[PDB]
Amino acid sequence: DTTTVIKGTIKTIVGFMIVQAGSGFLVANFKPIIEGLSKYHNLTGAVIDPYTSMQATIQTMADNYAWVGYAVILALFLNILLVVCRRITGIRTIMLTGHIMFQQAGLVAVFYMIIGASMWETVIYTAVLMALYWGISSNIMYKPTQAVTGGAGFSIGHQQQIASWIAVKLAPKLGDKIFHDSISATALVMTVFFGIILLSKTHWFMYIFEMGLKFAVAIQIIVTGVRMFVAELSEAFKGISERVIPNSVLAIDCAAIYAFSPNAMVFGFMWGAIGQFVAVGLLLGFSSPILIIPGFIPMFFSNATIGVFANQFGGWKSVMKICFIMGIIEVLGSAWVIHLLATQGTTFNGWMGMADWALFFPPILQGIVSIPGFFFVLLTLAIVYMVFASKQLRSEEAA
Amino acid sequence: DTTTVIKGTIKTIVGFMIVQAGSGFLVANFKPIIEGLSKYHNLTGAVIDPYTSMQATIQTMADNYAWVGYAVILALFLNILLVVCRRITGIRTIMLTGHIMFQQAGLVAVFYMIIGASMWETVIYTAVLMALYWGISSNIMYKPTQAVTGGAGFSIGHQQQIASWIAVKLAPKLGDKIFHDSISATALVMTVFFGIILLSKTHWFMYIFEMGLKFAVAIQIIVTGVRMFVAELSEAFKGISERVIPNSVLAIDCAAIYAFSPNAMVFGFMWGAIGQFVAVGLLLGFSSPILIIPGFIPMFFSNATIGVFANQFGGWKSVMKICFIMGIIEVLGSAWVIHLLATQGTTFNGWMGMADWALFFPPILQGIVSIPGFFFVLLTLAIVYMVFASKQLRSEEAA
Ligand SMILES: O=C1O[C@H]([C@@H](O)CO)C(O)=C1O
Ligand SMILES: O=C1O[C@H]([C@@H](O)CO)C(O)=C1O
Ligand SMILES: [Ca+2]
Ligand SMILES: [Ca+2]
């Protein structure tokens, strides 16, 4: 092969270069807006979006951003370890989507850096926490994913597995049985939210739409850059998982189940956007020191997947209620995490803003804030799920 | 349509912000290199490349780049008039390649601004020169294109029509009868040119490859932004030419003849890159006040088209001679234009660098600098063609 490895390396470097270009075009049009919030009132000022959080992670991670690559490879190795020993661990699924791994491990690593831990503590803690989150989350969501997909034989590996598990366990008690697309979407989101800020002439509105288009363009360059940056490496992840665990379960993208229920889409994402709208209204009401700018990606994908599971297990009513609560917890939890990051000693402007990154990981990051022994407590919980998963697997294959 | 109009406007705007993104990445990544050429030896420091010259045009024009659009539309209207009156002008061809129009009218307009003319003078003179160059230069290469393409029914509307004419007539006396593709090409070319600069360690060569990759990424973002920004308005131009002159002859991109001769591509580009290497070697040996950085687009495409026509009319021998001399004239003539634009009162670190933009336009800009009446001279020259050409058309319709 050798040569194709060189091709992959050069292509990934080009990817990170495009990420840097989109980051520059994003910064040169928004630093006087947050720094503009300094010479105004309560500073920051944050955007709920995974790619913006990846940008802020890179910029506040410098050349130490390679720790995210070390932690991604190491965490992937630990997940492969959790699948090879599926008999005593009960973990079958494996995480392989590259950009989701780099986003998640990136935010965890930047958390362990804002606190101020060493390099190896960040790589090891990030690897263990991320591997347990992937195997336990997807392996937890395997069965209901089989219920939604009609037994297709794959699980969900994204950023809302635990929230979708709250929808699976809570739904039966509430109901009865890409250029201009993303640019227009996220741009319209920025313009709508800016119009909401107006609730607290054609020239200023034209600058609203133009700010939405500059922001959306920057985010899109970031999207393509990240995708090409993790494309070949994730393809190698499939190359190794292809041979080490050939009969494993794949934790693929959440969108891969949207076609199994295209009805919970616009409605689930609709009430998720309503939840985030109400939550941002509450934030602007209480004069909170943190302003949240919602994004299209976590709304549509997170609240639409939770809309899918809440639809299959609890109909449109469970979609409305549970998805609304999910959006509120998304915005409020993101602002809370940003408060932690600010008090920990670093100015961070982005956050994942998904469902499992503004509901389940805020309490974990707060747990590491409280005690360094909270991590080993999380490991004991991982054994609590692990031994029972082993017993259920043994009593599930032999019976 | 109404809706698709505002849609297309949003599209062109978005494309323009992508252009600004690649531009910011480019100048932000390569400012200290030319500024380093200030604090060392002779300045400039120029890039033979169409998209870089378009970026520098948008830079040295700022909020006055709309004049380029005005001159593009007006020149289009003038060409439409010349084809409507094809009986008394002998003009069959019509240029519709929009991005070539914006590049050419952009450089001519930015020359008519750097010299200090007003808005209406720059728009009028640029529209006239562009209309006469497109209609006359593309109308000249109609029949030889029919001989090369076997009568495929189109002409060539690009950047080397005049050099293709000098090759067509100079040839018979000399012989017997796209992401990582462009990024890889231009990156390799930057590494080669930097290797020739070294003709005057792993960290140094790896940073050569990294600077070439950054420049390639910036140039590629500029490419996508230009194509998107132009696609809609050029599609409107084609929509008007569909109904005003349906039976007209289309002057299309030059590469559409490469399929009729895939052999002259790598050899014409071979001796063209050789000519660029020799001429740049002369600019380094003579200690010229202007350094020249070659680009992949001018070499490959200019010397490729000239290699195809000079191949059809004068074999591999005329390919070697005319392509080599054409490359030398490319480098030396472009650096010439950079010298004149330097004395005229501004700095311009990059030129179109194609065949006709280093052989035919340097003397035009020099003549306009000397006396403005020279412009009127060209106008009279057009009549010396048009009138004559007029009769020819009749002598080829009824005879
Ligand atoms: O969290 C994310 O969701 C989308 C996509 O993976 C969903 O299909 C994306 O690009 C992310 O970073
Ligand atoms: O001048 C140019 O030549 C190439 C292409 O048109 C040749 O096919 C390109 O992208 C330009 O902008
Ligand atoms: Ca490969
Ligand atoms: Ca169209």
Numbering used by the authors:
A (entry chain B), B (entry chain A): 37 to 213, 228 to 250, 262 to 460
Sentences copied from the publication:
To obtain the inward-facing conformation, we screened different possible mis-sense mutations of UlaA from Escherichia coli (ecUlaA) (e.g., G58A, G286A, and G58A/G286A), or homologs from other bacteria, e.g., V. cholera, P. multocida, and M. pulmonis, in which cytoplasmic UlaB is fused to the C-terminus of the UlaA domain. UlaA from Pasteurella multocida (pmUlaA) was finally crystalized after being proteolyzed with trypsin from the wild-type pmUlaAB protein, with a best diffraction of 3.35 Å. The protein crystallized as a homodimer in the asymmetric unit, and the structure was solved using molecular replacement with the ecUlaA’s core domain (PDB ID: 4PR911) as the initial model. The final model for one protomer contained residues 37 to 460 as well as a molecule of vitamin C. According to the high sequence similarity between pmUlaA and ecUlaA, a nomenclature has been adopted from ecUlaA for the structural components with 11 TMs (although the closely related protein VpeC (TC# 4.A.7.1.2) apparently lacks the 11th TM), four hairpin structures (HP1–4) and three horizontal amphipathic helix segments (AH1–3). The substrate vimtain C in the structure of pmUlaA is located close to the membrane surface on the cytoplasmic side; therefore this structure is identified as the inward-facing conformation.
The phosphoenolpyruvate (PEP)-dependent sugar phosphotransferase system (PTS), which catalyzes PEP-dependent group translocation, is used by bacteria for sugar uptake where the source of energy is from phosphoenolpyruvate.
